[PDB]
Write a protein that binds this ligand. Structure first.
Ligand SMILES: Nc1nc2c(c(=O)[nH]1)N[C@H]1C(S)=C(S)[C@@H](COP(=O)(O)OP(=O)(O)OC[C@H]3O[C@@H](n4cnc5c(=O)[nH]c(N)nc54)[C@H](O)[C@@H]3O)O[C@H]1N2
Ligand SMILES: Nc1nc2c(c(=O)[nH]1)N[C@H]1[C@@H](S)[C@H](S)[C@@H](COP(=O)(O)OP(=O)(O)OC[C@H]3O[C@@H](n4cnc5c(=O)[nH]c(N)nc54)[C@H](O)[C@@H]3O)O[C@H]1N2
Ligand code: SF4
Ligand SMILES: [Mo]
Length: 697
């Protein structure tokens, strides 16, 4: 009986967990003293280790390689030799026929770890010869989509999670940590215990709003209108930091011109917030000695979302809430390793350590390190473009590792046809997912629990996680799989352990070089940049102390005009639909839904939060199934009738089996509940049986 230290594989809070191991099996999980969690876990860390054991509650663990030889055929189990040879031969053949850019790779933001992601992008670049490497969820980063990067030159959380506790004001905008990042919510609560003020800008009455000094309950989609009026108040009442603006920013005058028209009064009907409330919130934010903005992954989907991110960041620039502790702009992103995948250069325009492929010095270094003559300079395809590339023949093969697009991507029949248009789809996962079940080849990897590595938490904190248990089947780690494919394609690659991979990237990434395995250890939390291996360098708590990471080191102001959501409301569709996380289950659900304790918590088809008054009016009872009508769409869901959602909007916990957050819908009650209930059981049994048969064939 021993404790093996790991990091939670769910959200990006980065909680350290001691997995109790007795006789080669995990026996229970308990909170370890991680930097972020300090002996606490939410439900998911505590009960969510159970999927490792292949419970088969929702879907089985992948146990063997598989190949679907004919297109409308069965996945058949095969040896590793057969699978890895097949893939190396197909990829090689595709590369020679169509060029390297005909192949798309993905990183993975989940249990695999940082080392895997570095290896995947190495494979794409040194072996295949393409920059086509990307992750679904990604930090604000590229030229093709606006974000934080244009404002401050880094898409990361500017300040640590542990810095939240001593901020004077937490400005939570489009963010629900109580359900999304329970341990981050504990830091917000502790900030309030420590006397911080709290402003929540959220249409709904979320948990954090209960403890908020102001809950700005703004109409769904009204974000830029509110943000501009807040900037208007800050500028017109002279509450901005003039020194900071003069010396550390540009673009003020152009921003001032736009927000000048946006009086709190001009925006009362649009935001549903009184001008007085707008003034008070803008005052509270501007007057706090140090204020941290927290927002969610989240804001970028409300669209005007990427403008909203910059408009928010502009508020922090306006008030000098950047380049000092307990302040900042802090997109707390979702997945346990969304940050790390990006750190490892699982993005189409950059090597690990945000060393852009367009720089010839960077190409030279990596090329030399990687024993290759030339590395490609042009930006690869984004995984979100896959349906378009596949349809038009630009991408012929997808190597999809640790992503489930046929579950978790907008319009599921788009990526389905994408898989049809593609010549070859490889899925490397730990479960028979919807996506894996539609693949040509399945490569089963080890899971979190069965291997080790490094994750990067929400605030760029590198942490080690250790192997607790041996895989029960003949599994390879993700990086073992890639390395073997790489070698079979003519490029010698092998590693004996993740430290070898980590040490290689350290020597290629000046901002990660100091973050040795020894420095991270069992409980260390090392935020990058960490440049010196000396134990004197323990990382960077917050960014931008001296300058910003923009070309000329000045932060860049931005906002724009408010534009009403594209899906307008009608008498035919009088409700807003938006999506929302729930604490007890995680998104893919292949992990939480395969945990006996967590699975007992959440019913199918899932829940839709409806306002009490809306429900009264519509004849919708609590717990009663309901239909939700959009356009080219209708869905069945369960009513969670509460006063938490705002009247006029329903919030679906959409984890169940580009404006994701605003959508015009109608909600109709079901007369025959018993038939609708049976129907739900019927469809869930269908899917469960389908994935079962896919796996045990
Ligand atoms: N328990 C659990 N936690 C998770 C996950 C999970 O599946 N389960 N998934 C993780 C992942 S991958 C992600 S991306 C995160 C997502 O977590 P979040 O970043 O928190 O995204 P949401 O919860 O979907 O939306 C957050 C808030 O946006 C509000 N909102 C909706 N419309 C508007 C608007 O127009 N303006 C404003 N200001 N607010 C609005 C909603 O009411 C909600 O409270 O959760 C992460 N954590
Ligand atoms: N319409 C719409 N579109 C959206 C989103 C939305 O809300 N709505 N969300 C966006 C972001 S926020 C989310 S996090 C992202 C989710 O997709 P993804 O990461 O691929 O699914 P995932 O479910 O987390 O699947 C992760 C897979 O990884 C497997 N896995 C987990 N651990 C490992 C491992 O160690 N090795 C390997 N090879 N695989 C592993 C999981 O089983 C799962 O299939 O896509 C964006 N698009
Ligand atoms: S899901 Fe998030 S808050 Fe909960 S134990 Fe895991 S890392 Fe911590
Ligand atoms: Mo996410």
């Amino acid at each position: 009986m021993k404790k093996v230290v790991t990091v939670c594989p769910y959200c990006a809070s980065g909680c350290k967990i001691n997995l109790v191991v007795d006789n080669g099996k995990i026996v229970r999980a308990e909170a370890a003293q991680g930097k972020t969690n300090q002996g606490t876990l939410c439900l998911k860390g505590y009960y969510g280790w159970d999927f490792i054991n292949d419970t088969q509650i929702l879907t089985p663990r992948l146990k063997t390689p598989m190949i679907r030889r004919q297109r409308g055929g069965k996945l058949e189990p095969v040896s590793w030799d057969e699978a890895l040879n097949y893939v190396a031969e197909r990829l090689s053949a595709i590369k020679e026929k169509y060029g390297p850019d005909a192949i798309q790779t993905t990183g993975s933001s989940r249990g695999t770890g940082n080392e895997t992601n570095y290896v995947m992008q190495k494979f794409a670049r040194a072996v295949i010869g393409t920059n086509n490497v990307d992750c679904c969820a990604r930090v604000x980063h590229g030229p093709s989509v606006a974000g934080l990067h244009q404002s401050v030159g880094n898409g990361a959380m500017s300040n640590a999670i542990n810095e939240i506790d001593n901020t004077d004001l937490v400005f939570v905008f489009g963010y629900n940590p109580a359900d999304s990042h329970p341990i981050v919510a504990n830091h917000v609560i502790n900030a309030k215990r420590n006397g911080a003020k709290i402003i929540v800008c959220d249409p709904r009455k979320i948990e954090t709003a209960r403890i908020a000094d102001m809950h700005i309950a703004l109409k769904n989609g009204s974000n830029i209108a509110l943000l501009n009026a807040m900037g208007h108040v800050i500028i017109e009442e002279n509450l901005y930091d003039k020194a900071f603006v003069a010396s550390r920013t540009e673009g003020f005058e152009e921003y001032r011109k736009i927000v000048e028209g946006y009086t709190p009064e001009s925006v009362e009907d649009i935001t549903g917030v009184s001008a007085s409330e707008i003034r008070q919130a803008a005052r509270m934010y501007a007057q706090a000695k140090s204020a941290a903005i927290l927002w969610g992954m989240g804001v970028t989907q409300f669209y005007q979302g990427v403008e909203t991110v910059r408009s928010l960041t502009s508020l922090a620039m306006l008030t000098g809430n950047l380049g000092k502790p307990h302040a900042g702009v802090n997109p707390v992103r979702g997945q346990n390793n969304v940050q790390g995948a990006c750190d490892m250069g699982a993005l189409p325009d950059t090597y690990p350590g945000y060393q852009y492929v367009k720089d010839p010095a960077n190409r030279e270094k990596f090329a030399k390190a990687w024993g290759v003559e030339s590395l490609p300079a042009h930006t690869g395809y984004r995984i979100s473009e896959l349906p378009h590339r596949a349809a038009h023949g630009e991408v012929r093969a997808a190597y999809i590792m640790g992503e489930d697009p046929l579950q978790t991507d907008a319009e599921l029949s788009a990526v389905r046809k994408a898989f049809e248009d593609l010549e070859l789809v490889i899925v490397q996962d730990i479960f028979m997912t919807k996506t894996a079940s539609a693949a040509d080849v399945i490569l089963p990897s080890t899971s979190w629990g069965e291997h080790e590595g490094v994750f990067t938490a929400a605030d760029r904190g590198f942490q080690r996680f250790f192997k607790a248990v041996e895989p029960k089947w003949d599994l390879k780690t993700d990086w073992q799989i890639i390395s073997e494919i790489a070698t079979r394609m003519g490029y010698p690659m092998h590693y004996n352990n993740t430290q070898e991979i980590w040490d290689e990237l350290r020597h290629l990434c000046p901002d990660f070089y100091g973050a040795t395995y020894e420095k991270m250890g069992e409980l260390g939390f090392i935020q990058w940049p960490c440049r010196d291996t000396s134990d004197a360098d323990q990382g960077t708590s917050y960014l931008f102390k001296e300058k910003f990471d923009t070309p000329n080191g000045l932060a860049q102001f931005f906002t724009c005009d408010w534009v009403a959501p594209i899906d307008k409301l009608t008498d035919e569709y009088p409700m807003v639909l938006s999506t929302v996380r729930e604490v007890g289950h995680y998104s893919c659900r292949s992990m939480t839904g395969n945990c006996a304790a967590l699975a007992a918590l959440a019913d199918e088809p899932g829940y839709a939060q409806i306002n009490t008054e809306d429900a009264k009016r519509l004849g919708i009872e609590d717990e009663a199934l309901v239909w939700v009508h959009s356009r080219k769409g209708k869905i069945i869901t369960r009513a969670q009738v509460s006063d938490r959602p705002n009247k006029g909007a329903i919030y679906m916990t959409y984890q169940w089996w580009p404006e994701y957050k605003y959508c015009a819908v109608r909600v109709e009650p079901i007369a025959d509940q018993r038939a609708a209930e049976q129907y739900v059981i019927d469809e869930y049994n269908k899917l469960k049986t389908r994935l079962r048969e896919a796996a045990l064939a």
